[PDB]
Design a protein around this ligand. Structure first.
Ligand SMILES: [Mn+2]
Ligand SMILES: [Mn+2]
Ligand SMILES: [Mn+2]
Lengths: 735, 128, 128, 735, 128
């Protein structure tokens, strides 16, 4: 019986070093082996480019290893947050590996040879959201545990007031976006299809040559219009200008790597319509692509003669005086919403804005109301309901409000999350058809234009069946009502409806409140009961899973770090994400400069409990059951005793919190009475740890306030990292 | 006092309201649209209303079993009983409500709303 | 008043209504025999001093509805009779059948008076 | 805002002495006054016979007082278990009261002078089940609270295995009993009726002069043929003998105080017919009434000369040679089934027998199979189905089985529970009619014989309406389907069916599974469901309410002493029974002799929670809600921490468990955040109690293991009892 | 979307009786029928109601999106010609052509957004 514990990047990794030894010590008491899997950015680079490496240097394909392991009914994988590499991050990681004797190739930005174009594609496999599409072979069960909600109640986080006179709102398209021209259908049998564009010339361009579809698959033909999108941006910028409200843009270019940078880019184009007109010729032969934000423009003009570059920056600030005020990522540095598409990520930025009382930062560094532009309507309308609701009701009260768990459809690159390699920026005007290869049958027709974003999302029948089952299970186990958020006026969501209606009958739903509502209705109904302190479960698609599991946890708890994220793997196993967020680069900074790690490991403690509980239910391990029960109360006690990491250096940090957890864990195991072997086994552990409490905490705190050597960043040296992360002689030995 | 105010309506209204626009009028409106003020997504106008201490949030109600004669009385702190309404004839199946608005809640609400309208710079209005 | 706010919100997000495309909203209103608030004028009082306000059956000593009120508070007892309610439900059905349009009874769940009405509507719909 | 807590008899009262102070302290924080009410056997003797008592000695008619309070829409009564006095109990209570200066008359068993008849008739008000009929002005909502059910799953109680080859069965009449001769009708209008017997002679005997009947009342005219009853017994006693299976008899002479002793008596008569023939003349003038069991015979022969009394007992033990084996109540002492009608009580004995695997105890001390004789078929056939089910399915599994909550028609002396003053042993062969005085119309005729038992049960229309409402209420609120146990072949239940069918339509039953099935079908349907882990509500008549709320809880939980018994009164208030069992005489035995009370007050804690919660809803007291939910979580923690009273002397007792409850109740209020004032109010208290925990516990346990002085039994001294029941001064001073 | 519509299916005999029962007392009913019944009925009732089928609309909304407009279901009337060649009087009623053209221009207007074609259709409707 074995649990895989992922070694990842930056902060969670550093924490793992201190925590792995303690989980291993507790897990062996139930005959559980804990093996690491290194899926760091460095490890993934070394696994891809083994060619130029020695035998000792080479790394196995650890990501792909886990990808296979998800097909095994006995899988038990605990996934920690890891880096989704941007280009700058990849570059830094390559230079660190090269510097350490690993001959890996330079990343070729603009490749001049055909062999450079070849390795740039191999690097593309490392860039961006690479891990998640592989590991997510089950659906999402994301929710906050009772002990965490009770902590929020006892220590209410700061929330900004919602004035009834608030001017902030969600501006979104009403025609010409993906939603309003969308086509959809469920497949009657297995088909192999192609995406073609029948041009005005009579020609037929092939955009995607072959894609294998199955029986019961739901496929969409959706497109956004370049013309409608520009017009929309024209209207909303002028409106923001006339009404005097700060302009902001909220998309997710990190994940939607094809469509969303185009959308982001157009916003910038029309906002600065005037400057991009005066410098059209210069910009094209400079190759500036502002889809990468203003960051791309500033970069390609930084090396220009002063007077020439200073004319361009003038034409940008001159364009501002008849434009609305812009939201700032960092006003002190002068970094705006338009700088980089990776700066303002929709799933995080929107809740941040709502929590702050519908506010974002301005040029002067003061919080302002905003027109949160959310071009695609499909998933943005639900935000507006909350805003409106908030205007009439005020800010949410974290002390009294209910919870909104989520049962998200995400398995096997579900819906939009798998459509990246099937999204195309239409080259010229024409008619876009998806066509069956083995028969001249046109399946979904659409009339598109030059610049349009066309795409074909896919959701498979098997994930859908599991998703309905997961929703029913959660209804049954928690007693909470579940609402499926499915529109009637969105073809894709009426297709899902047909399946949800059918597959609900294949279960025992006798005493369960289960209904289906359009998103805006569903959001309202949910808000209506949460404000009265009642709980509701949201059964949603992939993107809504993303949006809602940031929105509500941030409002309820103040963060999305302190929650359960369980993935019941379809083959029978289980994946346990410890965090939906990043790997916290700023956290590492504080540790390396003055050794205080302020990373909260509660998400790791929670996932482990879920992992141990499911291990017992699936393998018949009674000891694992007892370990899970003990850890839960230990986690609960850690919250109650307020022994989570402080942010201020010199005070209790991640390392100290891990001690208290292990103390309470050993304590719980000593005073439990369903397993006598374990009770007496941990009795001396609990006794030893409690009696040396103040010496251990002393050691773990007196070591702070100084620079520390971890031997790198993207590839830390284990020996030196282990020293830093386990500095208490007393704690190490007594363990 | 019997001539003052809305005197006519409560005497003639011995039925219920079937109020509706006639098709000819609705069809004329479609063909000849009246002017409508445009709504700004950034509009600051809102209904301000009480959250506690109004009729709604302290209301009690019942459906009556039988015909009875009730009075409305205030049992004062002193022990004295002031009769406010000597007699009212209730029928079986009558829905009656006991309903009150707190003076103190109303003044607090008003001080908060007037102040809020000022601090935000939005124009105050009262609709009764 | 909350109804108005919903429209305001709706209007902020959807814009102003278009008279050339919008549908009708006819009303079937309960009003017969000085129903609800429209008859409560003779039964509304500005409370002279702090005390308990009860509505009491004069024959026998049964206190039907009690309430704790303050000096300056406004307290009232609205009435709505059973046969008007019967007529109102029937009129709703008749208007539904004749026009062929859906009908929504605007009745709250968190308002005592409107739950009492709800009981009768649920009953008298079975009579048609 | 007043809660009425009932002072009763024996163990529950002793627990109250320690608990009343701590409930008062909590209830005052919400503005609720806890007012006492004394309904003990002693206080009921005093209230009746205030003839020779001083002003200070006199007590109000506390039962009549509470009976009157049920009409008050604000009634909040907590009913603890109380004595339903037998003759020996009555005498002992009288003798103690006399010796303490209370001048009350002796109870004359056989009144010599006619003045003794009046005071014997006045004592008849005190005898037996006198409290329940007065307090039950509502219908029964009996169910096991979720937290208790969960505890039974984690800690299963022992259950005897059911052999497929088991021979045990229910024996019951197929003709000549109440069921197979029943006539019933629903009243058209108000009537006044008399019960008359027109004899064969021509005389008219008035058994009941007048009874006032309302419109919509159901009345029955049921009788049991004496000739049939004896022939049945002859047959069954013979069958049990021939087949070699143990004979047992299960009736309820305790509450069915008129009919069932006649039923019990006849069994003894035909069983020992050979001895009752040899001594018929002697038995006659001794006034032997074996309707009171063999104990009656043994009493009346104990005074006789040795050679004669020994001859009698020899003719009784000699009769066993041609007879079947008898089930024993105490096989060491030789106390059998026939000793006393109050030993084997159908509602408790039948579950106990099923729980054991279909076993009762033998003369040899061994457990064996039994012919469980239940003469009246009406409510016994339902037991047989379970026996059959178990025979094919095995014994129930407490770790996986569902629940069977009950909604019981009992309000206003419903059905058989209010037919005692209307039951008659027929003096001679005739026709038994219930006749209207105004217009000499015979409503129901019936041809009866000498010995036959005749009765007219009554169930009023208004109770039936509330009963149906409570069924739909429970269905809506719990999501469980509900089944009405109504026979198609029983007049009474077809009359009820007419009503249920109609009154259901008066309610919103849109999302509910609600159906009507005959008893045996309903039982089978319910069993088919529990065994698959599914829940079902039983909406039943009065006697079935009693049977099923012992039966299922014994199987699910091991006891009927750990559950909610809510009585929503028809006038608006609520009565909350804390227990359905006795007042535990033996528990007092252990308290006075060795200072350990093993009474489980869980039923009190649960009832109080349901008392405080309903206080919040009815009045609008939000502070009541907070106390209720905090007691709910306090009671739940009591179970999970395993701190219910031990039975062993020297360990944690009733007093000790009351400390832990009040501790957790205090903690739950301190660490909650839905009421700011209450939180900081209990904060120092909760901090106090927890701090000297193993000091208070140390006191409450050290004082055990010795004889103690409470100053009486039926009327214990309030000053002495309070010293004993609150022996921890550390604990007491803390409030 | 059939929510406010009365739609039902009956056998031919029943449907005919049902239809007759309503039309004998001024009520209108649409007959949704198969091919031969379409023929039979659009002669029968138009003859009974109007005397001829040469005074009605026969619109064929073409499946591909267009529209065919039959001006008459009857023949080309040879005897009308005999009168025109011998006496110079054409008694042919072109009312079926006026109505068809009116339906043609109206569909033209709604299909292609032509407002001037809509105005031609309405002016023809009133002229007819
Ligand atoms: Mn997210
Ligand atoms: Mn019982
Ligand atoms: Mn024809």
């Amino acid at each position: 019986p074995t649990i895989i514990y992922t070694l990842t990047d930056e902060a969670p990794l550093l924490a793992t070093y201190a925590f792995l030894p303690v989980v291993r010590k507790f897990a062996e008491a139930a005959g559980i082996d804990v093996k690491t899997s290194d899926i760091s950015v460095a490890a993934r680079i070394l696994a891809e480019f083994g060619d130029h490496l020695t035998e000792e240097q080479r790394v196995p394909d650890n990501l792909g290893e886990l990808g296979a392991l998800t097909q095994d009914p006995s899988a038990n994988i605990i996934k920690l947050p890891n880096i989704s590499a941007s280009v700058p991050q990849l570059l830094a990681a390559i230079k660190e590996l090269q510097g350490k004797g690993y001959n890996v190739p330079d990343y070729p930005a603009n490749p001049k040879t055909d062999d450079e174009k070849k390795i740039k594609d191999r690097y593309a496999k490392i860039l961006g959201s690479a891990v998640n599409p592989v590991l997510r072979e089950g659906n999402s069960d994301r929710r906050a545990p009772k002990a965490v909600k009770e902590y929020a109640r006892k220590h209410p986080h700061s929330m900004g007031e919602w004035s009834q006179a608030s001017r902030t709102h969600v501006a979104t398209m009403k025609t010409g976006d993906f939603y309003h021209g969308e086509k959809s259908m469920t497949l009657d049998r297995d088909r192999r299809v192609k995406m073609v564009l029948k041009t005005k010339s009579g020609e037929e361009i092939v955009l995607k040559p072959e894609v294998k579809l199955d029986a019961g698959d739901i496929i969409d033909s959706m497109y956004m219009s370049k013309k409608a999108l520009i017009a929309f941006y024209e209207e909303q910028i002028e409106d923001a200008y006339k009404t005097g409200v700060m302009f902001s843009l909220h998309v997710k270019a990190t994940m939607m790597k094809v469509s969303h940078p185009i959308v982001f880019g157009h916003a910038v184009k029309v906002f600065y319509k005037d400057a991009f007109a005066k410098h059209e010729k210069l910009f094209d032969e400079l190759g500036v692509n502002v889809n990468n934000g203003l960051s791309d423009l500033y970069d390609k003009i930084e090396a220009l003669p002063a007077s020439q570059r200073e004319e361009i920056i003038e034409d940008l600030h001159k364009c501002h005086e008849h434009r609305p005020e812009l939201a700032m990522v960092d006003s002190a540095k002068g970094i705006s919403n338009f700088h980089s598409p990776s700066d303002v990520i929709v799933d995080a930025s929107m809740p941040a804005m709502i929590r702050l009382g519908g506010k974002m930062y301005g040029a002067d560094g003061r919080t302002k109301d905003t027109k949160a532009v959310n071009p695609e309507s499909t998933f943005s309308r639900m935000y507006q309901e909350m805003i409106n609701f908030c205007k009439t009701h005020g800010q949410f009260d974290p002390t009294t409000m209910g919870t909104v768990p989520n049962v998200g459809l995400m398995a096997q690159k579900a819906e939009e999350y798998g459509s990246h390699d099937k999204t195309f920026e239409i080259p010229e005007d024409g008619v876009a058809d998806i066509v069956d290869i083995d028969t001249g049958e046109v399946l979904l027709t659409q009339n598109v234009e030059e610049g349009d974003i066309w795409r074909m999302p896919i959701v498979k029948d098997a994930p859908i069946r599991d998703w309905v089952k997961l929703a029913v299970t959660r209804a049954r186990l928690s007693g909470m009502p579940v609402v499926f958020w499915l529109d009637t006026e969105r073809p894709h969501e009426v297709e899902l409806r047909k399946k949800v209606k059918e597959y609900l009958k294949d279960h025992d739903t006798e005493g369960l409140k289960i209904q289906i509502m359009p998103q805006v209705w569903a959001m309202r109904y949910t808000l209506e009961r949460v404000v009265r302190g009642k709980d509701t479960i949201a059964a949603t698609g992939n993107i809504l899973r993303d949006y809602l599991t940031d929105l509500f946890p941030i409002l309820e708890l103040g963060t999305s770090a302190k929650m359960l994220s369980i993935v019941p793997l379809m083959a029978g196993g289980g994946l346990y994400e410890t965090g939906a967020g990043g790997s916290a680069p700023k956290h590492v900074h504080q540790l390396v400069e003055e050794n205080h790690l302020r990373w909260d490991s509660l998400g790791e403690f929670l996932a482990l409990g879920a992992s141990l509980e499911d291990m017992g239910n699936k393998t018949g391990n009674e000891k694992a059951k007892v370990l899970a029960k003990a850890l839960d109360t230990a986690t609960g006690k850690l919250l109650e005793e307020n022994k989570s990491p402080s942010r201020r250096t010199g005070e209790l940090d991640n390392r100290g919190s891990q001690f208290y957890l292990s103390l309470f864990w050993a304590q719980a195991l000593a005073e439990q009475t369903e397993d006598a072997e374990l009770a007496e086994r941990f009795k001396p552990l609990a006794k030893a740890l409690a009696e040396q409490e103040e010496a251990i905490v002393s050691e773990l705190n007196s070591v702070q306030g100084k620079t520390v050597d971890i031997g790198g960043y993207y590839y830390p040296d284990p020996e030196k990292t282990s020293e830093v992360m386990r500095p208490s002689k007393t704690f190490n030995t007594t363990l």
